[PDB]
Design a protein around this ligand. Structure first.
Ligand SMILES: Cn1cnc2cnc(Cl)nc21
Lengths: 13, 352
């Protein structure tokens, strides 16, 4: 299982 | 050897020609980089539809009132661009987009700002995101994936020669044009880097291990990301796949990848060399540079010059009903663009 929709960037993880 | 005389000579000559091209491309980029603003205003456009959304704003289809041309307008709420790395990144994006020129990179037309927002107006690419075509069909066959991959390899060869790292490769950021070729957009994470850089940024599934591990990193992160993209295009899902970012990160750093049984051995070999944790072994990062990728067996059928010249027939051509058609894009919640009577964050965005 995992993310199937659009994925957002992270600006500072 | 693998190549006979004629082939080895043709390849060498081809590689020298690439060097000559990149040297001229750097001369042209630097002139624009050293001399970038305010090329339009909001009331010059009719706003038609939201084409995509992110944390800081949205991209809208707009119609230029005077000329009737359609464009994609990215709108950033200055206040939401709150964090330090968010500001610097927005200035990188505009400055890079105004200076680059390549057939697979979206063309910026105007840039401006008002009391509330920053605006970048670029060519509208009506065929939609690779993302939605990929999700709808499931996966691309290897020749189809390879056609898109070759365009990314050439685009990264170009960007990296200018000391630019891209840092956000994914299908969501790759639009399909009316001839079936790719246009890279979203330069929100792109940066000029002469050696290493340190910001923790990108999209979880596409992050190289060295980013996750808080190590100073270089342009090789883009080559790792190409491995993730090729895998996702050919499988229909990315190689490090989990519901939460922290689980994704643990899989990335492990050094383990599994492949679908339908992947060719040539494809698996390429991917094991791109998805290589050890930077002393990662393709794109070795003494022969991009040539280890371009000369790999999986790309043996690729005519690199023909791809650049757009001479190759694309695997598919999006349907297009006329200027301003948005049928290849998903729908999003529409929010009115409100401009405040008071300037926000004027000092933080002076350079924009
Ligand atoms: C391979 N092929 C042929 N027709 C197509 C339509 N959409 C997509 Cl994504 N791929 C196609």
């Amino acid at each position: 299982a995992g993310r199937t929709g659009r994925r957002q960037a992270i600006h500072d993880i | 050897g693998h190549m006979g005389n004629a082939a080895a000579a043709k390849k060498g000559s081809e590689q020298e020609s690439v060097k000559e091209f990149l040297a001229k491309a750097k001369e042209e980029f630097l002139k624009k980089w050293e001399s970038p603003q305010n090329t339009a205003q909001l009331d010059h456009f009719d706003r038609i539809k939201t084409l995509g959304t992110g944390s800081f704003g949205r991209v809208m289809l707009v119609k230029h009132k005077e000329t009737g041309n359609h464009y994609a307008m990215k709108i950033l709420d200055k206040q939401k661009v709150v964090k330090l790395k968010q500001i610097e990144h927005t200035l990188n994006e505009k400055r890079i987009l105004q200076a680059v020129n390549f057939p697979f990179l979206v063309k910026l037309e105007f840039s401006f700002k008002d009391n509330s927002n920053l605006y970048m107006v670029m060519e509208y690419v009506p065929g939609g995101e690779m993302f939605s075509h990929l999700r709808r069909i499931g996966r691309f066959s290897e020749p189809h994936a390879r056609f898109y991959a070759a365009q990314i390899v050439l685009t990264f060869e170009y960007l990296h020669s200018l000391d630019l790292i891209y840092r956000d490769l994914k299908p969501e950021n790759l639009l399909i044009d009316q001839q079936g070729y790719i246009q890279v957009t979203d330069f929100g994470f792109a940066k000029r880097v002469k050696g290493r850089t340190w910001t923790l940024c990108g999209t979880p599934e596409y992050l190289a291990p060295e980013i996750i591990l808080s190590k100073g990193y270089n342009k090789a992160v883009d080559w790792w990301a190409l491995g993730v993209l090729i895998y996702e295009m050919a499988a229909g899902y990315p190689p490090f796949f989990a519901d939460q970012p922290i689980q994704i990160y643990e899989k990335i750093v492990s050094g383990k990848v599994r492949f679908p049984s339908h992947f060719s051995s040539d494809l698996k070999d390429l991917l094991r060399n791109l998805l290589q944790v050890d930077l002393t072994k990662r393709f794109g990062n070795l003494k022969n540079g991009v040539n280890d990728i371009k000369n790999h067996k999986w790309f043996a059928t690729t005519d690199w010059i023909a791809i650049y010249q757009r001479k190759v027939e694309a695997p598919f051509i999006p349907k297009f009903k006329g200027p301003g058609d948005t049928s290849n894009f998903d729908d999003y919640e529409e929010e009115e663009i409100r401009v405040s009577i008071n300037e926000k964050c004027g000092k933080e965005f002076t350079e924009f």
